[PDB]
Design an enzyme around this catalytic site. Sequence first.
Site, PDB file in Angstrom:
ATOM      1  N   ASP A 157      94.715  29.319  49.135  1.00 61.74           N
ATOM      2  CA  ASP A 157      94.737  30.338  50.293  1.00 61.74           C
ATOM      3  C   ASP A 157      95.726  29.773  51.169  1.00 61.74           C
ATOM      4  O   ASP A 157      95.972  28.700  51.464  1.00 61.74           O
ATOM      5  CB  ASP A 157      93.212  30.579  50.920  1.00 61.74           C
ATOM      6  CG  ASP A 157      93.262  31.716  51.737  1.00 61.74           C
ATOM      7  OD1 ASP A 157      93.887  32.898  51.613  1.00 61.74           O
ATOM      8  OD2 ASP A 157      92.717  31.355  52.962  1.00 61.74           O
ATOM      9  N   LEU A 158      96.092  30.775  52.243  1.00 62.13           N
ATOM     10  CA  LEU A 158      97.034  30.108  53.372  1.00 62.13           C
ATOM     11  C   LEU A 158      95.975  30.152  54.757  1.00 62.13           C
ATOM     12  O   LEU A 158      96.003  29.042  55.253  1.00 62.13           O
ATOM     13  CB  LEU A 158      98.053  31.042  53.458  1.00 62.13           C
ATOM     14  CG  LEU A 158      98.914  30.558  54.665  1.00 62.13           C
ATOM     15  CD1 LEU A 158     100.578  30.293  54.102  1.00 62.13           C
ATOM     16  CD2 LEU A 158      99.205  31.142  56.016  1.00 62.13           C
ATOM     17  N   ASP A 159      95.836  31.239  55.315  1.00 60.35           N
ATOM     18  CA  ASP A 159      95.117  31.318  56.675  1.00 60.35           C
ATOM     19  C   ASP A 159      93.676  30.753  56.517  1.00 60.35           C
ATOM     20  O   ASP A 159      92.964  31.492  55.840  1.00 60.35           O
ATOM     21  CB  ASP A 159      95.159  32.763  57.313  1.00 60.35           C
ATOM     22  CG  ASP A 159      96.653  33.104  57.650  1.00 60.35           C
ATOM     23  OD1 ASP A 159      97.008  32.540  58.662  1.00 60.35           O
ATOM     24  OD2 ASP A 159      97.314  33.602  56.979  1.00 60.35           O
TER      25      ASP A 159
ATOM     26  N   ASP B 222      88.955  30.416  52.089  1.00 65.15           N
ATOM     27  CA  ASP B 222      88.020  30.201  53.196  1.00 65.15           C
ATOM     28  C   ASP B 222      87.404  31.831  53.421  1.00 65.15           C
ATOM     29  O   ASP B 222      86.380  31.626  54.286  1.00 65.15           O
ATOM     30  CB  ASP B 222      88.546  29.670  54.306  1.00 65.15           C
ATOM     31  CG  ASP B 222      89.388  30.774  55.102  1.00 65.15           C
ATOM     32  OD1 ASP B 222      90.368  31.392  54.268  1.00 65.15           O
ATOM     33  OD2 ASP B 222      89.519  30.954  56.174  1.00 65.15           O
TER      34      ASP B 222
END
EC number: 3.1.3.12
Length: 246
Positions: A20-22, A198
């Site tokens: 995931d990124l953010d 997250d």
Amino acid sequence: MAEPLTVSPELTANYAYFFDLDGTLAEIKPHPDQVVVPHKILQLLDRLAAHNAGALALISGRSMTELDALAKPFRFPLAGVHGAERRDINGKTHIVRLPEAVVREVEALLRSTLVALPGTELESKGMAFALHYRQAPEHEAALLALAQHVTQHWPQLALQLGKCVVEIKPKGTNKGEAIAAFMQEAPFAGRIPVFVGDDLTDEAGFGVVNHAGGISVKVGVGATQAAWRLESVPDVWRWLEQINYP
Ligand SMILES: CCCCCCCCc1ccc(O[C@H]2O[C@H](COS(=O)(=O)O)[C@@H](O)[C@H](O)[C@H]2O)cc1
Ligand SMILES: [Mg+2]
């Protein structure tokens, strides 16, 4: 129930990585355009992918083009818009398409309600809509009821709740099926999936990674389906650094 992740896999193990990124590779910001992945971390991801036959992908709710801007100058396999956009190892892109009338009618609907929800931002993604309300947390119950009713009148659309965002996406789109699409393709196929995320959208990925006998890692606080947990984004960075350089 999730166990603290402490061990870093070896650089030349048989893993397929999904990040995931953010909130995972980049720290959370008050505005998405302030988000940055440090160039040191991008180099660790690129080196990690290189030692694993290129089996590393970014699985994000952001649009594909925003991921390319955040990952510049590197170009990874990608899943954007929770899987509604995807780019495989061959650079080939796959786009979920909604009826043009649905996109037009829903956007006109959502825009007219913003005058009564000040502080909320409507992000149009081509085949999805994101309602950001970080500057006005009071609107969260209204945006949920509004988006829920959008999905009932337009059954082609599904609800995706998230951190300070209520997202409307194509039905059948989720990060689990995005990870599935990758796991049957050449570089990722035959490796053990590792997914780090997250938010609620990442729980769908955690489910398919657990069923596959892989490694699911939750970042931050909150109930999770992941077997493993990292406490913060800098802990993802340190875990990433220890894989590259033990
Ligand atoms: C000042 C105190 C800090 C408090 C800030 C809280 C805000 C948290 C937050 C708000 C909006 C977010 O939206 C952005 O990221 C999404 C998820 O991307 S993902 O995590 O890589 O799946 C994407 O869907 C969106 O398009 C993109 O705009 C992501 C995180
Ligand atoms: Mg996320």
